[PDB]
Design a protein around this ligand. Structure first.
Ligand SMILES: [Mg+2]
Ligand SMILES: [Mg+2]
Ligand SMILES: [Mg+2]
Ligand SMILES: [Mg+2]
Ligand SMILES: [Mg+2]
Ligand SMILES: [Mg+2]
Ligand SMILES: [Mg+2]
Ligand SMILES: [Mg+2]
Ligand SMILES: [Mg+2]
Ligand SMILES: [Mg+2]
Ligand SMILES: [Mg+2]
Ligand SMILES: [Mg+2]
Ligand SMILES: [Mg+2]
Ligand SMILES: [Mg+2]
Ligand SMILES: [Mg+2]
Ligand SMILES: [Mg+2]
Ligand SMILES: [Mg+2]
Ligand SMILES: [Mg+2]
Ligand SMILES: [Mg+2]
Ligand SMILES: [Mg+2]
Ligand SMILES: [Mg+2]
Ligand SMILES: [Mg+2]
Ligand SMILES: [Mg+2]
Ligand SMILES: [Mg+2]
Ligand SMILES: [Mg+2]
Ligand SMILES: [Mg+2]
Ligand SMILES: [Mg+2]
Ligand SMILES: [Mg+2]
Ligand SMILES: [Mg+2]
Ligand SMILES: [Mg+2]
Ligand SMILES: [Mg+2]
Ligand SMILES: [Mg+2]
Ligand SMILES: [Mg+2]
Ligand SMILES: [Mg+2]
Ligand SMILES: [Mg+2]
Lengths: 102, 98, 68, 223, 43
RNA sequence: GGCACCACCAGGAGUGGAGCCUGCGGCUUAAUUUGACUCAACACGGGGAAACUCACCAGGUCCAGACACAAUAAGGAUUGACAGAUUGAGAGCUCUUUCUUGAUUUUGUGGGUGGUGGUGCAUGGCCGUUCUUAGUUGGUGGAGUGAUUUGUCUGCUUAAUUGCGAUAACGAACGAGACCUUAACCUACUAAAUAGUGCUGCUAGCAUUUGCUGGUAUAGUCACUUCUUAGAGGGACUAUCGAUUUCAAGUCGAUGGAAGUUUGAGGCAAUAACAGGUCUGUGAUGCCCUUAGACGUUCUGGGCCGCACGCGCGCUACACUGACGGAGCCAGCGAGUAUAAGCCUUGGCCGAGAGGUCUGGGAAAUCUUGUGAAACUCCGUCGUGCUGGGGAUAGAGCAUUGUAAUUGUUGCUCUUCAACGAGGAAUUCCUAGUAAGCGCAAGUCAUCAGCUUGCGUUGAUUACGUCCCUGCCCUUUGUACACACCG
């Protein structure tokens, strides 16, 4: 249990904090001589819900079209497990959630 | 409401020591997951307590939020015949943070 | 139609009254100049303001323009 | 248990939507503005912004202690897994939620509408709002219902900037004769915005003429 | 406020409400035995 | 005067004519719950109702009527109950029957509480409509005693109160435009074993020329980012050149360009307003009604589908530019589960089918999935025939979902094979990847899509104009209207 090929999966609704955490981890993986693969932009998922505007059923048939974009990025690191987890706490962000899988 | 004295008891030592109780609005639920009695019993037992000014009741999104009044701690002080050591847990003066 | 609005017409002619010597008849040069002269919130309004300023510059060399 | 990515971000949002309304009903009297859920390792930080952080943190912080317990018992959270903090809103005048709750507490005290309406028009502007408009609709002693708008200053209406520089709050006011509906629209000054754009899209700021220097024929200044 | 009065008053009485509150609120900011043990001590 | 395919011109596809689906009225009903009636009611209430939903009808239970009292009450206030009768019912609902529990609780008073009960003509919020048309407003100045007026306009122009220009006005604000999302470009950056490729290992088939098609490849511990994904940017601003014009705003042609109709399409959208629609979305609501033989809630069964009829949104078709039968074989938008209460389901094996069974993958750019979709194309049969067009109506049978399919949920098999031979008066939608076909996904959803919301395949005819009809806006005008002609 030392140096491993380690995956960090990043998902969030907003891209600004996602790219800051992504760049900050990449920055810390640069000055630290750790070979890295990423970030990989997964195809963004558009969660769309189309309801009727009318609470009742009177009027012209008008519809809302709500959206919820989900952006997912995965980054591959080659480092021991202790090093990668402390990197996560350095780049902790409320919006972006992190899951680590070996 | 017809609650057995023993089942009503468990309802009272949950509304004290963690002096707040949350109950989902379903009358036929077998177990409220935190008071080993019928869920309907919990709603109606605490409906009397809020009816007699011992707990505040708040309702939001089909859920009951029961909180114990300071006047209600004294009521369980005597009726339960418990030692006069008070402060259930939400009154234990854990103090906030700044 | 391609009728420019007032937010681009009046803002472009303020530039000529203020930065005529540095302006020119080339849109590409004018486009870069107005990014350091004015604070434009959107890129599209940048290439519009400069595109109408170029037309006015092209018109000033043929005679006097009204409003400048 | 095992929940999909699509269904997890929605659940976090749905949890926020239900949690937000819970504070509006419970902490209505304390000028509740909004809630911020700061997820972190080993803890669930929740920041509530209210005009009065004494009613929540009262009698040795008994209410806030008894209020975080109502959330552990409803969302099956560990007692240590959640922490609630009460934070004072810095600029109370710029929050339409606080202004709408304040108006309701005045209307329910029998104060006249004109005196109550102008109390938020001047309070919003005093805090530095670019503009404000208040609409109150319902029935008052008269059988027929009416609405009155009270504008002031500059207000934008269409396009994206209304989503950036305007916050809104609608509440229903329970009167002895019916329901009063109040709308508090407050447009903040874009120059003070610290996260989004700092000006309106069509605001063009031309720099000043740096010219009018004197040119001398052709020397060379050595160094 | 369907009158020439009480609306004058709405404005003035209303504005002195805010002026008193901006200064008051700007001052408010510038100066900023257990229970389960008793259920187990039956030994 | 002006604008507009919810107006017309030139046209296209039609609808109205047939059968059927579905909604509305009517009729009927034990009930066939109900809202909505020109645009802006009638495939609308996301309303595709077997139960639930459910509000209706015929019946049967429960209090889930908190709380202060008063009465009763341990010599027991009350709750549950085997067996038989009763009941649709193994509802102690009720009746014979004596057992059990024990001050929680039974009766009266107040007080509640709950209502898809009434009032949307008492209200909030929301939505539709006037109207997404282009309109609206104040400061100073001018006119008027004033309310007011000018600014906000003759003309040209624009999609536009948007601009030029004329000007007792000048300079502005909201709305418009800007803004935001999406689609089309980037061999220029940043990377990608959940994307792709060339090489390279290993490997197959065909002619041997070293070539042409593949499989394999999560260690080849390769190379690259064009195709694929998305973040930071760049790129179009009517750019250059010709014409017209008050030489102005602009418009029309070319050239370059990925894009030159606001680049295509949308989201948001002003000042006021309507007795517009919803209390049948809300533990949103005022008031009225009901509240124990309930108008609360639950259980059973039926109804919302009921059929001499009028009307609206649509689907199949009336054939040969076609039906079948084989064969070729291409998208995009999306969705997907765990001790559940069961998701998407490949692959294998049975079965004519519908469908069944065993494993495995996928909480997902990984697997379903290249969703190998349909129109379409090729080759055949048919040969103008109510024919192999069309597939109602009906008989018999086989499966699926569901407690439950009878008034057939749906699917499949055989058989029956009806009107309809292009549709009167009228009337709808539409200008480029558009119309028209053609399917697929998501929503409702245990099952059922002739419905909507989107997506993509194939892909046109005809204007790029006008106020002739119709609607709306502006100016002038009249007014005994201002609750504003519903005067
Ligand atoms: Mg604007
Ligand atoms: Mg706009
Ligand atoms: Mg015609
Ligand atoms: Mg047809
Ligand atoms: Mg429908
Ligand atoms: Mg029913
Ligand atoms: Mg029933
Ligand atoms: Mg019925
Ligand atoms: Mg009912
Ligand atoms: Mg109405
Ligand atoms: Mg209304
Ligand atoms: Mg004036
Ligand atoms: Mg004046
Ligand atoms: Mg204007
Ligand atoms: Mg504007
Ligand atoms: Mg691989
Ligand atoms: Mg190979
Ligand atoms: Mg557009
Ligand atoms: Mg009406
Ligand atoms: Mg109701
Ligand atoms: Mg209701
Ligand atoms: Mg509803
Ligand atoms: Mg009943
Ligand atoms: Mg019906
Ligand atoms: Mg029937
Ligand atoms: Mg329709
Ligand atoms: Mg064929
Ligand atoms: Mg795939
Ligand atoms: Mg025949
Ligand atoms: Mg048939
Ligand atoms: Mg016609
Ligand atoms: Mg018409
Ligand atoms: Mg059905
Ligand atoms: Mg479907
Ligand atoms: Mg008049």
């Amino acid at each position: 249990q030392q140096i491993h090929k380690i995956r960090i999966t990043l998902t969030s609704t907003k891209v600004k904090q996602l790219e800051n955490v992504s760049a900050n981890i990449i920055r810390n993986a640069a000055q630290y001589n750790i070979v890295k693969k990423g970030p990989v932009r997964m195809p963004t998922k558009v969660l769309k819900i189309t309801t009727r505007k009318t609470p009742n059923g009177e009027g012209s048939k008008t519809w809302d079209a709500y959206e919820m974009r989900i952006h997912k990025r995965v980054i591959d690191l080659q480092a021991p497990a202790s090093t990668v987890k402390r990197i996560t706490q350095i780049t902790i962000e409320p919006g972006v959630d992190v899951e680590v899988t070996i | 409401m017809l609650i057995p004295k023993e089942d009503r008891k468990k309802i009272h030592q949950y509304l004290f020591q963690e002096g707040v109780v949350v109950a989902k609005k379903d009358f036929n639920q077998p177990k409220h997951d935190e008071i080993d009695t019928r869920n309907l019993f919990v709603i109606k037992a605490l409906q009397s307590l809020t009816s007699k000014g011992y707990v505040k009741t708040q309702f939001s999104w089909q859920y009951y939020y029961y909180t114990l009044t300071d006047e209600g701690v004294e009521f369980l002080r005597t009726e339960l015949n418990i030692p006069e050591g008070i402060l259930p847990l939400t009154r234990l003066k854990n103090a906030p943070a700044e | 139609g391609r009728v420019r609005t007032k937010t681009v017409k009046r803002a472009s002619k303020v530039l000529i009254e203020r930065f005529y010597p540095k302006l020119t008849l080339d849109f590409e040069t004018n486009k870069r100049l107005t990014s350091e002269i004015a604070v434009i919130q959107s890129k599209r309004l940048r290439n519009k303001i400069a595109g109408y300023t170029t037309h006015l510059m092209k018109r000033i060399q043929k005679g006097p323009v009204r409003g400048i | 248990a095992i929940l999909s990515k699509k269904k997890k971000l929605v659940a976090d949002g749905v949890f926020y939507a239900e949690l937000n309304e819970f504070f509006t009903r419970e902490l209505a009297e304390q000028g509740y503005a909004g809630v911020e859920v700061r997820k972190t390792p080993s803890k669930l930080e929740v920041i509530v912004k209210a005009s009065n952080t004494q009613g929540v943190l009262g009698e040795q912080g008994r209410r806030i202690h008894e209020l975080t317990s109502l959330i552990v018992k409803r969302f099956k959270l560990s007692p240590e897994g959640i922490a609630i903090y009460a934070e004072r809103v810095e600029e109370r005048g710029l929050s339409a939620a606080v202004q709408a709750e304040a108006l309701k507490a005045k209307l329910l005290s029998g104060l006249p509408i004109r005196r109550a309406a102008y109390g938020v028009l001047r309070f919003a502007m005093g805090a530095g709002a670019k503009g404000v408009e208040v609409v109150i609709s319902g029935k008052l002693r008269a059988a027929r219902a009416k609405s009155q708008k009270y504008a002031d200053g500059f207000m934008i209406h269409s396009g994206q900037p209304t989503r950036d520089f305007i916050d809104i709050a609608i509440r229903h006011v329970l009167m002895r004769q019916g329901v009063l509906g109040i709308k508090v629209k407050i447009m903040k000054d874009p120059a003070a915005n610290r996260f989004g754009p700092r000006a309106l899209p069509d605001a063009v700021k031309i720099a000043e003429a740096k010219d009018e220097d004197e040119v001398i024929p052709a020397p060379t200044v050595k160094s | 406020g369907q009158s020439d009065k009480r609306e004058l008053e709405g404005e003035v009485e209303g504005t002195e409400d805010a002026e008193a509150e901006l200064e008051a609120e700007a001052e408010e900011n510038d100066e900023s035995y257990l229970a389960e043990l008793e259920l187990s001590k039956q030994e």
